[PDB]
Design a binder for these strands. Structure first.
Lengths: 134, 441, 258, 184
RNA sequence: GUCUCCGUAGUGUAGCGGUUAUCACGUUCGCCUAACACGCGAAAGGUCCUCGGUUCGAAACCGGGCGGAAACACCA
RNA sequence: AUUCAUAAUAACUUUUCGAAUCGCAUGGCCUUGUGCUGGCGAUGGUUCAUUCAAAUUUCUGCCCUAUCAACUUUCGAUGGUAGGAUAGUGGCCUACCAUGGUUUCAACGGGUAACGGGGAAUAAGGGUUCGAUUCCGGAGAGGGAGCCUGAGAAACGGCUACCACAUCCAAGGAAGGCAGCAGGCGCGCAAAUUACCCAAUCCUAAUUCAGGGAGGUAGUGACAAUAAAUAACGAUACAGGGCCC
RNA sequence: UAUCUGGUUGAUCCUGCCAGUAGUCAUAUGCUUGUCUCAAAGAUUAAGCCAUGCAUGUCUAAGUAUAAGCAAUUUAUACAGUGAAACUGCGAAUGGCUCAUUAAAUCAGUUAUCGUUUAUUUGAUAGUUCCUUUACUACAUGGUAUAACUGUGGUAAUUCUAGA
């Protein structure tokens, strides 16, 4: 939080992926860590971009305290960020919402149950209902 | 949504307990027609055609051959108001301990009384069980009950009135002496074998206007037995207390480990929970829980739930233990305990070293009275004498007693269902009491 | 076992891929293609661990699906395409053309070539036969089939494939005084000149290739690749040019660089 | 099916575990250098045996041998780097003449004592394990660090330590707050 | 879990509702040596498994509990 | 090194292939018309080569036993001829003919608390023991046999039959092979949760999107390994080691 | 880190064995147990038997739709957007588990296929198929169902199936 001094290293350029990769070295003297939103904010103006155009992960704090090493990415456009950044990091900051597809267990059971019927099942449902009405 | 209650059933031999129970289960969606028709065929080959309804609960070979309910048996049926399961009591002085095990895990009670000429007089006699079974119900914690006058066709005249009014008058005089208010108790005339006045109103007996009850909570007035089962009050379930479920049975189920089964007297049992059985001292984890072939997440108090243990064995586990959460205060072995007991007539005198088969909850064991502390008044715990020399019938007393065999017990203040007990000696109920203090091991 | 195998555990993969042994238990098995699986390089490992352009497996898939790389003129879309020796990957973006040439140490390299050099690819022919309808053809090391070749072209020579048109434009005969490139074996990646050879008409022809520093070594004829005459390489040689310095000379080179 | 990790034992138990002469020797060494477990002496002897075995295998080969020369100087360079061998003893024969005390002297515990910041080797151990001492710009809490004649000038109090300035500390605050409130 | 056959000194194990004792081994005790040893000369050793009654009176008459010795059972 | 690749003759086919498939952008010539030409692709297709492979095969090498010294050939054993079958060579099989083939240089038969190897423990050297177990090559889906589909199976999380097991039965009948991931009984000295995710490493499909108990993560875990708390530092009461008076 | 010791005898020197000693990716068990990293784990006896729940299905710009499914075409009169199910084309013979059988057998190093098959890929590769081949025939193009679906259903049950 004090004297963050975000220094970037190993900067590279990828017109292939429309992104620039760099191992971001951040020092946090007398402070524990720097929050992910913190480095992303000042990552915008050093690369002359916006907040919602950068991506950083890692940040394993060096033993003893006062240093942290992480790897960061910057994307040129919002649409480029959507089409390249993975969904887990998208929902992470503010970029999208993770919809709960129930869980793996019920989906597998539903798939097997749907596999046990040959067709839509509307005729099967009405046939079993008529036969088992009594 | 529908609540859940638990009933037990009681009565004299050949009063029509299992016939009334089984046929009531059949009417309320228990079993389909081909199952009971099979039972009619097999019992006709045996020779006991009348017992086809009794066979539904009496499943054992020795029970069906003899035509005798030896051990208790469970069976469910959904009434109009809520869920309920029955305890089929033996109704014998031979198997009186099995009745005490069944009635101890029951909230309400269905006192079946014979109406036929001669059988009622034999039932309510010195040797009969109608006096005993009603007394044993109030002893173990069955506060509310229902009386059912059975065999109206057999009695003379069948479905008359007088005979019914004579039985209700005779029971009302005795049942007041036990503790039950006969105003609050419902008296229903029925026929178990015929299937009369149980589900629907009877055509054979229009004279019967209708039973009625006068409680503090709410009044009820029904025509049939089924409506009287709906009018039973929801009991007070102590969910907040530490678990104190004395086990009922321990099965080794196919493809799902060891499965301990028992009613949650107190607390909430659930899957993935370590438990400790009290006398044997065996710690183990439960795999899963069930109640009448249906799985459960939360086993609430007063339920026929059944956990399943794991990482151990069926012999380490046993009928009688208390799965007090190995995390919460578990049930410990009792070396000696302060358990007052009042007596209900011991032909012999009660002094010391006398080990009757203390049947606290579901467990029966001989207990020797180390000594007698104080002769106490019949009520309010009033101290009358210091250090008595002997005790007689019709007298209360605090007594410290050492079990002859490892037993688990607990105080009445902590656990009301656990604290109840009776005493038996010379094939008769000599005393009845409650435990206030207990020394752990 | 009851058919082919489509898997590669991350312990039987070729060691020149420079793959680790902790990131997963499997390896990117190359699909069937021009080169063998043990003598080529999948596009996934080349872009993820060599160029470091892509981090994860899906990033390589996204780059490949976006029609960016061009291997031997063809764009290609398979993540496990077996790109081996004499394979040129052209990237329209970043303005770099990459050529797969072995290094002195025994792995692949990231040698950068000009756009003119990427227009032609050298190829060592393996078989010359008279095919159906009487048409002659040659079989290069990459498996390319070129019809109606030069009659002077025989077995164990090298041709200059035009790549863009797929036509032979120049052929280099195999004789003494020819700069070659060893492909495969414990002596792979060495560049030297041929002095003589013992024919040994029982298989496994041997050729005595001599380095520019008077170092001589023996390599089977199946592992050689003529890349030009003496002193003039038809291809831009990688850095070092296969000097093959010893462990002592390498250590002094490091101490003279730090 | 992942590749298994490699593990190795770094100590060798003595063949004769029951001998007064050897028993007193390690007790003297452990007490002088401030060591709790004699496995630490077992460990440091195990490393000595390995390098002696490697150096012995080198001495059975002729001079101007590419294998003997390359590994010989590499082992010699490592030893003189870590400071167990002096500059004038780089001849591959004194390597066989190394003792346990020479290796033990290079431990960070002894160097902290030698530079004069602990006043006792046992106080060096508590200083090591309480994170009051750092190497360069990194806090090290391992007693065995084996400084290599280049970080010896970088041994100093950590910036995040009460002894070397910084925030006063835990028990001091409780005492300071107690006396401040008592006087207030 | 239900049903059946037995329970008796220390090992053996008799024996028999008005009352439990015997028998060998053993268990000790005086005997000698130095400790012995054999040789010897004498006597210490059971709520009749537990409780409850029947009982003038029971361990044995009866029933309950336990122990052991045998069975059949025991899908939340 | 070929009766090799290949070409041409005379025929054989009941006849193989030689595009009736699909998506975008829709452009030019004029004899001004649903006239005539025209791109970037996907799918499929006969043959060759290549690649991922598959199946045979040359040489050498495996534990203990002679209280196993002869083995094989009835009814296949050795070799030859010719033919069937195979995707191919071949007693693989068949018909005929010859009587061969192996063996103290350890055949054959028996036991194996015997899958083999890369390797592991142990030590100066030599060597001994172990190796089911993360990788490679093999066998099996309870014990055998048979077969369809497909390039590839003699497949069992594919079927057919028998035997030993075993489930649902309103007694006619139907449905199964956990030595897959968890979990249950039994066995024993002896060995874990009936959890989460395709986020990584990969594989498969028409394919960037989907699926994968392959796999990864967490939980139980003192199988084995690495480092390392449980204590240190001043002042006072005694007891010292050089030395000053 | 190329090391020994105790025990036959009144005592000595030997042979000789027993015991001691240290290690084990050799297990099992006992007592105790505070921390970080890494991590084996139903093989040994039973390749003994399994309740239950999962473990392989799959599409693009581009095989087939009028879902009597969902939004809007308004660039589209035949759809041409998204798209369940089904047909079709592939995969399901990979992976995973176990070590029962097996002692020139498997397997390891090393050769051959001039003695064979080879999906999928990669690079190439069909001016010649109207057969009295002039009416014998659509080639700005042929024929036939069938699934899904609509409705009738049967059996107690099955990933059971019929008729229209």
């Amino acid at each position: 939080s004090d004297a963050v001094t975000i220094r970037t290293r190993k900067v590279i350029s990828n017109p292939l992926l429309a992104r620039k990769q760099f191992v971001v070295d951040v020092l946090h003297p007398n402070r524990a860590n720097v929050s992910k939103d913190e480095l992303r904010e000042k990552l915008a103006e050093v690369y002359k971009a916006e907040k919602d155009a950068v991506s950083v992960f890692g940040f394993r704090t060096q033993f003893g305290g006062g240093k942290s090493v992480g790897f960061g990415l910057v994307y040129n456009s919002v649409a480029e960020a959507k089409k390249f950044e993975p969904t887990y990091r998208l929902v992470r900051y503010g970029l999208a919402e993770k919809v709960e597809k129930a869980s793996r267990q019920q989906r597998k059971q539903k798939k097997n149950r749907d596999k046990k019927i040959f067709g839509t099942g509307k005729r099967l449902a009405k046939k079993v209902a008529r036969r088992n009405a009594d | 949504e529908k609540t859940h209650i638990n009933i037990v059933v009681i009565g004299h031999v050949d009063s029509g307990k299992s016939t009334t129970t089984g046929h009531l289960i059949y009417k309320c969606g228990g079993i389909d027609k081909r199952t009971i028709e099979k039972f009619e065929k097999e019992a006709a080959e045996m020779g006991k055609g009348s017992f086809k309804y009794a066979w539904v609960l009496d499943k054992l070979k020795a029970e069906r051959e003899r035509g005798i309910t030896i051990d208790i048996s469970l069976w469910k049926f959904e009434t109009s108001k809520y869920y309920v399961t029955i305890i089929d009591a033996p109704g014998h002085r031979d198997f009186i301990k099995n009745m005490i095990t069944g009635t101890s895990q029951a909230d309400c009670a269905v006192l079946i009384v014979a109406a036929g000429v001669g059988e009622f007089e034999a039932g309510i006699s010195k040797n009969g069980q109608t006096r005993e079974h009603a007394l044993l119900a109030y002893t173990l914690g069955v506060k509310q009950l229902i009386v059912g006058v059975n065999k109206m066709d057999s009695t003379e005249p069948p479905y008359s009135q007088k005979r019914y009014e004579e039985i209700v008058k005779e029971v009302s005089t005795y049942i007041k002496k036990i503790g039950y208010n006969p105003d609050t108790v419902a008296f229903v005339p029925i026929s178990g074998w015929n299937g009369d006045n149980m589900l629907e109103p009877s055509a054979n007996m229009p004279w019967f206007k209708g039973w009625k009850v006068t409680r503090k909570d709410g009044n009820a007035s029904g025509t049939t037995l089924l409506e009287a089962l709906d009018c039973i009050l929801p009991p007070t379930r102590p969910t907040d207390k530490p678990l104190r479920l004395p086990l009922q049975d321990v099965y080794k189920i196919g493809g799902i480990g060891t499965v301990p089964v028992g009613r949650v007297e107190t607390g909430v049992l659930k899957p993935g929970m370590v438990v400790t059985f009290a006398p044997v001292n065996v710690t183990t984890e439960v795999k899963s829980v069930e109640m009448h072939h249906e799985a459960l997440s939360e086993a609430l108090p007063g339920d026929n739930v059944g956990f399943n243990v794991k990482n151990v064995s069926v012999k380490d586990v046993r009928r009688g233990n208390v799965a007090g959460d190995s995390k919460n205060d578990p049930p410990m072995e009792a070396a000696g305990f302060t358990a007052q007991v009042i007596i209900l007539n011991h032909p012999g005198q009660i002094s010391a070293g006398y080990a009757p088969v203390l049947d606290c909850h579901t467990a029966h064991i001989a207990c020797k009275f180390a000594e007698l502390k104080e002769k106490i008044d019949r009520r309010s715990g009033k101290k009358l004498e210091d250090g008595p020399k002997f005790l007689k019938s019709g007298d209360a007393a605090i007594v410290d007693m050492v079990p002859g065999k490892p037993m688990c017990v607990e105080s009445f203040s902590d656990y009301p269902p656990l604290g109840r007990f009776a005493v038996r000696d010379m094939r008769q109920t000599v005393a009845v009491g409650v435990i206030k203090a207990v020394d752990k091991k | 076992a009851r058919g082919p195998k489509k898997h590669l555990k991350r312990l039987a993969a070729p060691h020149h891929w420079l793959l680790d042994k902790l990131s997963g238990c499997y390896a990117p098995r190359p699909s069937a293609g021009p080169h063998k699986l043990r003598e080529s390089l999948p596009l996934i490992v080349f872009l993820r661990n060599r160029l470091k352009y892509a981090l994860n497996g899906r990033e390589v898939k996204a780059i490949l699906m976006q029609r960016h790389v061009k291997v031997d003129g063809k764009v290609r879309t398979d993540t496990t395409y077996p790109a081996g020796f004499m394979d040129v990957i052209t990237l329209d973006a970043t303005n770099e053309n990459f050529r797969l040439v072995y290094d002195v140490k025994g792995r692949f390299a990231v040698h950068r070539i000009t756009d003119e050099e990427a227009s032609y690819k050298l190829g060592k022919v393996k078989k010359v036969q008279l095919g159906k309808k009487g048409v002659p053809y040659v079989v290069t090391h990459d498996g390319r089939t070129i019809r109606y070749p030069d009659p002077n072209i025989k077995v164990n020579d090298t041709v200059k494939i035009d790549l863009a048109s797929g036509k032979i434009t120049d052929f280099i005969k195999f004789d003494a005084g020819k700069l070659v490139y060893v492909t495969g074996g414990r002596n792979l990646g060495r560049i030297g000149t041929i002095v003589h050879k013992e024919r040994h008409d029982g298989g496994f022809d041997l050729v005595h290739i001599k380095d520019s520093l008077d170092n001589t070594f023996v390599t089977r004829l199946n592992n050689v690749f003529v890349i030009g005459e003496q002193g003039k390489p038809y291809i831009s040689l990688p850095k070092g040019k296969g000097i093959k310095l010893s462990i002592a000379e390498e250590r002094d080179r490091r101490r003279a660089q730090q | 099916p992942r590749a298994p990790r490699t593990y190795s034992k770094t100590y060798s138990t003595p063949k004769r575990p029951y001998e007064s002469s050897r028993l007193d020797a390690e007790l003297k060494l452990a007490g002088e250098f401030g060591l709790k477990n004699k496995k630490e002496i077992y460990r440091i002897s195990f490393q000595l045996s390995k390098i002696r075995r490697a150096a012995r295998d080198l001495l059975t080969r002729d001079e101007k041998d590419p294998k003997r020369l390359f590994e010989g100087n590499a082992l010699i360079r490592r030893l003189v780097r870590v400071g167990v061998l002096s500059e004038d003893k780089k001849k591959l024969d004194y390597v066989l003449a190394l003792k346990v005390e020479d290796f033990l002297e290079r431990r960070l515990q002894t160097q902290v004592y030698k530079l004069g910041l602990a006043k006792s080797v046992h106080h060096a151990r508590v200083l090591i394990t309480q994170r009051h001492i750092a190497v360069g710009k990194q806090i090290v809490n391992i007693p065995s660090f084996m400084v290599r004649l280049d970080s010896e000038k970088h041994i100093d109090f950590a910036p995040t330590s009460p002894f070397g300035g910084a925030r006063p500390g835990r028990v001091a605050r409780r005492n300071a707050a107690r006396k401040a409130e008592a006087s207030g």
